[PDB]
Design an enzyme around this catalytic site. Structure first.
Site, mmCIF file in Angstrom:
data_model
loop_
_atom_site.group_PDB
_atom_site.id
_atom_site.type_symbol
_atom_site.label_atom_id
_atom_site.label_comp_id
_atom_site.label_asym_id
_atom_site.label_seq_id
_atom_site.Cartn_x
_atom_site.Cartn_y
_atom_site.Cartn_z
ATOM 1 N N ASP A 1 -3.864 -22.367 -12.551
ATOM 2 C CA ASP A 1 -3.671 -22.567 -12.914
ATOM 3 C C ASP A 1 -3.927 -23.427 -14.008
ATOM 4 O O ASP A 1 -5.009 -23.664 -14.859
ATOM 5 C CB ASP A 1 -3.950 -24.042 -11.807
ATOM 6 C CG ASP A 1 -2.243 -25.049 -11.940
ATOM 7 O OD1 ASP A 1 -1.780 -25.026 -12.335
ATOM 8 O OD2 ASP A 1 -2.687 -26.182 -10.766
ATOM 9 N N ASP B 1 -0.629 -21.402 -2.166
ATOM 10 C CA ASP B 1 -2.677 -21.617 -2.518
ATOM 11 C C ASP B 1 -2.653 -23.521 -2.165
ATOM 12 O O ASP B 1 -1.966 -24.183 -2.030
ATOM 13 C CB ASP B 1 -2.713 -21.784 -4.020
ATOM 14 C CG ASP B 1 -2.312 -23.118 -4.792
ATOM 15 O OD1 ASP B 1 -1.781 -23.199 -5.023
ATOM 16 O OD2 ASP B 1 -2.914 -23.800 -4.552
ATOM 17 N N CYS C 1 -6.869 -14.224 17.115
ATOM 18 C CA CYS C 1 -7.485 -14.134 15.920
ATOM 19 C C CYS C 1 -8.573 -13.090 15.593
ATOM 20 O O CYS C 1 -9.321 -13.217 16.614
ATOM 21 C CB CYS C 1 -8.482 -14.606 15.455
ATOM 22 S SG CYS C 1 -8.833 -14.986 13.352
ATOM 23 N N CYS D 1 -10.575 -11.723 13.133
ATOM 24 C CA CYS D 1 -11.304 -12.301 12.690
ATOM 25 C C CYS D 1 -12.168 -11.926 12.884
ATOM 26 O O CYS D 1 -13.168 -11.288 14.027
ATOM 27 C CB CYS D 1 -10.755 -13.012 11.433
ATOM 28 S SG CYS D 1 -11.967 -14.772 12.100
ATOM 29 N N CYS E 1 -14.497 -14.465 14.552
ATOM 30 C CA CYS E 1 -13.875 -14.438 16.304
ATOM 31 C C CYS E 1 -14.573 -13.749 17.225
ATOM 32 O O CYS E 1 -14.116 -13.590 18.431
ATOM 33 C CB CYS E 1 -11.937 -15.054 16.677
ATOM 34 S SG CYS E 1 -11.896 -16.813 16.025
ATOM 35 N N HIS F 1 -12.759 -17.769 9.513
ATOM 36 C CA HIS F 1 -11.780 -17.511 10.256
ATOM 37 C C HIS F 1 -10.379 -17.890 9.470
ATOM 38 O O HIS F 1 -9.303 -18.152 9.888
ATOM 39 C CB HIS F 1 -12.194 -18.095 11.225
ATOM 40 C CG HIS F 1 -10.877 -18.864 12.517
ATOM 41 N ND1 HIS F 1 -10.042 -18.034 13.361
ATOM 42 C CD2 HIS F 1 -10.532 -20.152 12.150
ATOM 43 C CE1 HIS F 1 -9.933 -18.518 13.856
ATOM 44 N NE2 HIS F 1 -8.978 -19.798 13.180
HETATM 45 ZN ZN LIG Z 1 -10.761 -16.317 13.044
#
Ligand SMILES: [Zn+2]
Ligand SMILES: Nc1nc2cc3nc(NCc4cccs4)[nH]c3cc2c(=O)[nH]1
Ligand SMILES: Nc1nc2cc3nc(NCc4cccs4)[nH]c3cc2c(=O)[nH]1
Ligand SMILES: [Zn+2]
Lengths: 366, 366
Positions: free
Chosen positions: A92, A263, A301, A303, A306, A332
């Site tokens: 930016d 963003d 999820c 990730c 998780c 996460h």
């Molecule tokens: Zn997760």
């Protein structure tokens, strides 16, 4: 790879999915860009940011010029080398801080209180020193609410600054040959001003077009109303970037209205505050109801957080003020955002994005 | 693997190197144990802790009984599952907090101010609930300095508590069959009291023996003097654990005096404060001289931080208060400690530890 190439692979209504190819990598769109304000995405190594699925991250001219300094970063080999992220970075221009984090404003630029100066020329130079891949024009984010007269005056100055930004970027051969430049549309909530801004930017010509001046307190209904008429004013064949947005529902609705890039600090900042995103809506992990909950943050999820840790453990970490709590929450949340973007891209590619949006909302707001 | 087996593979003077085999893994000795007070090694995922070379980590009965609670951790499946570390964990008994983090003390135990109680029986029970692999006897760390009379009275109580700890541990079959119990020698700086303590502990019989009551302000010369006579009093065929030690030079000297196990908050705590360990001695990364230093924290260190990031970047992160700064400093410092332990183990195995100690000191204190 070329300096810059945006290709649209599939469409559904106003929504598009495709890719931006740049020298440092490919960006899948619609894209979410994690925010890395102080040359770090908070609480994450760059490798972890990449593992969540991010193709590009955001830095800020204003923050980096103050600390550690733009010239210093250049001496050290540029922002990519400095922080260890070798993929594209969008920076930016400082235009949001022109009214945010006081100042003395003129047609020349803005002086911030040690005293620092920003102008179209200096902002573009700083972004060069950082080695930014996508450079944002130096603009002014019009405060909200604004009267039509003030919104017009502000927008007109921003368009003059956009031309100065274009010329500064073009005069620096290494920058012009290796980076891209995006213009920023202003005009507050007024259709005629948004149109004038779009016309001015398209006349100058940019690699991409941001919708500026939103996510400034107007609320989702008004933001969507403005997007309804504003996005179609921008060149269709270039990326559309909605600055500062946003919550998952905001992203879905903005994609429905033709936005390609996003963003926001929400997943990182609110993560450290205890808020975790799930497909059934956000939860605050600090809540006592999670103290003995062995389930992961979200049931679906993919990730790493998780896969391994319980709500109960993360609850304890955040309550105790432990750094690992911030690390796990942030990983996460950013992974959740990237999974959202992937589902958006797949659904547009398969011509079922409208159904996805409906299904997403039904469950998220149940 | 057995419940507990300590084997000595090589010796040089009083120094030993070998292995402790336990059900959850093998511990290479001399060993450094990262401290994980609040069910986390600060700023590190367990996988990162393991990657640095750690075989075992330390938890604390006192801190965990307060938050999140011992019964709660048991309900959630135990400390290993809770925090995601599947290798051995040693838990301190709370005896250091008996004079640290007020209290009401008696022969029965200690009541801490909400009101909580610790006793040999309750401490051993809490360590069972956590699922600790190496359980420490509940003792009293005698304050320093102490008069001979007070040191004796304190030590005598600790020895009575050691017997109660032994009996509590043995009466709980699952614990007795799957965990190990270490006794803690007291006696302040007095040889006769240290001898009486050692005799009492050996009579009771433990899987390992800690030297307690040191690293309490006495200084290295005095600590080494006490170790000189204290360690040979302990059974030779069991591990010797020096609680709370320490700086790299302290570790080297303690190994020269027969110590096998170490823990301290120094690499983690001081890391977040800006202190980085190097083979040329510690540095404080906050210092302005590092602002443009492109070298890694240490020129030889094999850790991931030194492979990827500069002093200049880490300087910026720590100055800015960024979480990634704490993450990188901690990973490097713990990795440095593990590399130190590896060099110690290799040098003893090769019969050149005396030369290593001399070489280490010459460079570290140059
Ligand atoms: Zn997760
Ligand atoms: N340069 C620039 N950055 C922006 C960043 C922004 N962030 C938000 N909300 C959070 N709105 C923005 C709006 C602008 C804008 O109009 N110009
Ligand atoms: N239980 C127990 N823990 C200890 C932990 C300790 N930590 C330090 N210094 C840091 N000294 C210690 C000494 C003892 C001790 O005598 N007993
Ligand atoms: Zn290192």
């Amino acid at each position: 790879r070329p300096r810059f190439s945006f290709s649209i692979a599939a469409r559904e209504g106003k929504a598009r999915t495709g890719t931006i190819e740049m020298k440092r990598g490919v960006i899948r769109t619609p894209a979410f860009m994690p925010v890395g304000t102080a040359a770090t995405v908070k609480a994450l190594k760059p490798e972890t940011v990449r593992a969540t699925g991010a193709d590009i991250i955001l830095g800020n001219t204003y923050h980096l010029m103050l600390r550690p300094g733009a010239e210093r970063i250049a001496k050290l080999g540029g922002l990519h080398s400095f922080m260890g992220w070798d993929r594209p970075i969008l920076t930016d221009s400082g235009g949001y801080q022109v009214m945010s984090l006081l100042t003395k404003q003129s047609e020349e630029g803005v002086t911030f209180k040690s005293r620092h100066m920003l102008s179209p020329e200096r902002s573009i130079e700083i972004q060069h020193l950082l080695g930014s891949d996508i450079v944002m024009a130096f603009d002014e984010c019009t405060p909200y609410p604004a009267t039509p007269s003030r919104a017009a005056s502000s927008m007109e100055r921003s368009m003059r600054w956009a031309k100065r930004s274009r010329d500064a970027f073009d005069s620096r051969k290494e920058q012009a040959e290796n980076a891209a430049l995006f213009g920023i549309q202003q005009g507050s909530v007024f259709e005629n001003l948004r149109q004038q801004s779009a016309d001015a930017l398209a006349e100058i010509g940019f690699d991409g077009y941001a919708v500026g001046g939103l996510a400034v307190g107007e609320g989702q209904d008004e933001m969507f109303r403005v997007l309804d008429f504003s996005v179609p004013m921008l060149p269709d064949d270039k990326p559309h970037y909605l600055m500062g947005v946003g919550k998952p529902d905001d992203i879905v609705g903005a994609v429905e209205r033709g936005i390609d890039m996003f963003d926001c600090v929400l997943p990182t900042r609110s993560g450290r505050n205890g808020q975790a995103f799930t497909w059934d809506g956000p939860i605050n992990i600090r809540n006592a109801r999670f103290s003995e909950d062995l389930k992961p943050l979200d049931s679906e999820c993919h990730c790493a957080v998780c896969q391994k840790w319980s709500r109960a453990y993360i609850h304890h970490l955040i309550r105790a003020g432990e750094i690992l709590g911030a690390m796990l929450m942030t990983e996460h949340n950013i992974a959740f955002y990237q999974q959202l973007m992937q589902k958006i891209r797949d659904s547009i590619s398969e011509g079922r994005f409208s159904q996805f949006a409906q299904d997403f909302r039904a469950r998220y707001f149940a």
